[PDB]
């Protein structure tokens, strides 16, 4: 199933290792200004 990469600094610029970090986000039922009553706010 698996295979390595071949990395040396003898590689060209297209064959250079990237340390890709991916940030993924969401929004859920999961999560101070004084309350104003009867004011458009």
């Amino acid at each position: 199933p698996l295979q390595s990469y071949g990395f040396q600094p003898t590689n060209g610029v297209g064959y250079q290792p990237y340390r890709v970090v991916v940030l993924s986000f969401e929004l859920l039922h999961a999560p101070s200004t004084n309350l104003v009553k009867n004011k458009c706010v």
Epitope: P1, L2, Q3, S4
Partner: antibody, heavy 118, light 108 residues
């Protein structure tokens, strides 16, 4: 990176001798592993596989002596017990790996002598 | 039955700068699943070619593999004084695996 073997020695025929071979550098776990035989002046003869990624054990029917093979994966080590001995098996053994068109992982142990004689 | 290998010649005493063709023939049609090894007698078998047509790290193109089916070829070129040792071919097509009987390239 490196393979170490259990100690070889002179054993009487018909007996049993467990063979230990521990890995280093990268694990046994993700790969398979093999055993081969070299008698002095004779070619390298394959013996048996191990396949940890499922579980299966294949033996050579040329030397079909129920030489049993299993693991100690958490020590990166492998155990094949020398069962039903006979003197022509007196040779050196190697821990082996085959580059099956995908990998380049062929790493070989140092070699220890099993001797079958009274 | 088993798959028979045919390594020819089983030895060849050679000289400096040669181009030796160590042939490993097969009893069946094996796709490319054949390898090559360096063994000075007492060493570990250092892999030379994988899948019968691909070089290896540390080993330059003085060794060169080709062939498929039944016919497999070890193309040693510009034969070096360190290359004189006992070599081997290798199937990985089926189970059981067998290896060739070896070819000792040695100084004439």
């Amino acid at each position: 990176q490196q393979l170490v073997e259990s100690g070889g020695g002179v054993v009487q025929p018909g007996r049993s001798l467990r063979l230990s071979c521990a890995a280093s550098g990268f694990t046994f776990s993700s790969y398979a592993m093999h055993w081969v035989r070299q008698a002095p002046g004779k070619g390298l003869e394959w013996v048996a596989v191990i396949s940890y990624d499922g579980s299966n054990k294949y033996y050579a029917d040329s030397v079909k002596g129920r030489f049993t093979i299993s693991r100690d994966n958490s020590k990166n080590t492998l155990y094949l017990q020398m069962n039903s001995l006979r003197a022509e098996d007196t040779a050196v053994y190697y821990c082996a790996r085959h580059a099956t068109l995908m990998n380049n992982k062929d790493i070989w142990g140092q070699g220890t002598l099993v001797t079958v004689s009274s | 039955g088993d798959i028979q290998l045919t390594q020819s010649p089983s030895s060849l005493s050679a000289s400096v700068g040669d181009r030796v063709t160590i042939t490993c023939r097969a009893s069946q049609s094996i796709s490319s699943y054949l390898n090559w090894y360096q063994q000075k007698p007492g060493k570990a078998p250092k892999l030379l070619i994988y899948a019968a047509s691909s070089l290896q790290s540390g080993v330059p193109s003085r060794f060169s593999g080709s062939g498929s089916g039944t016919d497999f070829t070890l193309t040693i070129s510009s034969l070096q004084p360190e290359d004189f040792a006992t070599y081997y071919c290798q199937q990985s097509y089926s189970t059981p695996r067998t290896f060739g009987q070896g070819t000792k390239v040695e100084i004439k």
